RNA sequence: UUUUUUUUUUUUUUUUUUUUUUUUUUCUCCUCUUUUUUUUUUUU
């Protein structure tokens, strides 16, 4: 059963990974999401998507230390 | 008015046999980063 669990998990993960495949995410209106947080880490705060349901740790600090501002 | 003679196509056939796919080289080798590892639950 635990193996089955992992199977559903990574199967749906792979199915989601192709939703974000090569088909150009630049002019088809399937690009912008929203975001809330739930936990802070020392380089990027954990993000969440209420409209799809995906998680993942992002980064504010980038490789070249070029930290973010906004216009 | 121009007679007579000068051989030709090698002889032979009534011999035994108890093996066996292939075949014979090439060295040690830096796997990058949010994690502990999540977990009940119900509709297949």
From Swiss-Prot:
Component of the RNA exosome complex. The catalytically inactive RNA exosome core (Exo-9) complex is believed to associate with catalytic subunits EXOSC10, and DIS3 or DIS3L in cytoplasmic- and nuclear-specific RNA exosome complex forms. It comes from Homo sapiens (Human). Belongs to the RNR ribonuclease family. This is DIS3-like exonuclease 1. It is found in: Cytoplasm. It comes from the Eukaryota. Catalytic component of the RNA exosome complex which has 3'->5' exoribonuclease activity and participates in a multitude of cellular RNA processing and degradation events. In the cytoplasm, the RNA exosome complex is involved in general mRNA turnover and specifically degrades inherently unstable mRNAs containing AU-rich elements (AREs) within their 3' untranslated regions, and in RNA surveillance pathways, preventing translation of aberrant mRNAs. It seems to be involved in degradation of histone mRNA.
